[PDB]
Amino acid sequence: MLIAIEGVDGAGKRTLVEKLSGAFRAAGRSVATLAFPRYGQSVAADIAAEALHGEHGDLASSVYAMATLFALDRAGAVHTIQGLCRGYDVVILDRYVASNAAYSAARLHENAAGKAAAWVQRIEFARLGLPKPDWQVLLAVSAELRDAELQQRTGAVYAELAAQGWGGRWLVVGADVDPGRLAATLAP
């Protein structure tokens, strides 16, 4: 089973991943985790990070150019993801394809029903063949939570993506989620 944990930076995804992993293991389920972007492991991810810090000329000014680098980062991990899914009962990804839909739409002042969100789904799931997650868990935070307005808009798109079932089933949870009850909901 493939589970994606989603949310804006600072939401607390990492702690939720650890909480859910322990809950899964406590129930007898093996767990592996993988975090995107793979900074320090993917040239596409590293070029993106560097672009965000003002390097590589005007690269960061293109929303779709940045989204493509993150998509290419995941496309190189597809064999890794499949291997984990074959060896572990649950695979939890800290950020996945929906991250591209949320930030790309937010950067372009669009909503989950907009072009950018639909473009991400087409290119990552349809063309590049990335496995669709069985679950996408949105760790939701408020508007008050670098660029503060971008994170707020990204948060709103996230909720819309979840409400629309973008790419599969979603769960909307808060920070202090009940780990045993959540693992039971995800893996019955």
- Residue stretches of the annotated binding site for ATP: 7-14
Rounded Cα distance, 170 and 157, in Å: 13
Considering the rule CB under 8 A, would residue 108 count as an interface residue with its own copies? yes
Instruction: Out of 2, 3, 6, 13, point to the residue binding Cl ion (CB under 5 A).
Output: 13
Residue set of the binding site for Mg(2+): 9
As given in the structure block, the two tokens for residue 13 are 């995804």
Considering the rule CB under 8 A, would residue 61 count as an interface residue with its own copies? yes
Considering the rule CB under 5 A, would residue 16 count as an interface residue with Cl ion? no
Cα 113 to Cα 71, 116, 158, 176: the distances in Å are 19, 9, 11, 29
Q: How many CA atoms, within 13 angstroms, populate the side-chain half-sphere of residue 81? A: 24
Considering the rule CB under 8 A, would residue 52 count as an interface residue with its own copies? no
As given in the structure block, the two tokens for residue 117 are 């969100």
Query: Among residues 61 and 188, whose Cβ is nearest to ligand YUI?
Result: 61
Q: How far is the CB of 103 from ligand YUI (least distance, A)?
A: 3
Residue with tokens 């690269």: 59
Considering the rule CB under 8 A, would residue 49 count as an interface residue with its own copies? no
**What does 65 bind: ligand YUI, its own copies, Cl ion, none (CB cut-off 5 to 8 Å by kind)?**
its own copies
Nearest C-alpha neighbor of 63 from the set 72, 55, 52: 52
Query: Among residues 10 and 28, whose Cβ is nearest to ligand YUI?
Result: 10
Cβ-based burial of 20 (10 A; exposed 0-12, middle 13-18, buried ≥19): buried
Which spans of this chain sit near ligand YUI (rule: CB under 6 A)? Answer: 9, 36-37, 39, 49, 52-53, 70, 95, 99-100, 103, 146
For binding to Cl ion (CB under 5 A), which residues are involved?
Answer: 11, 13
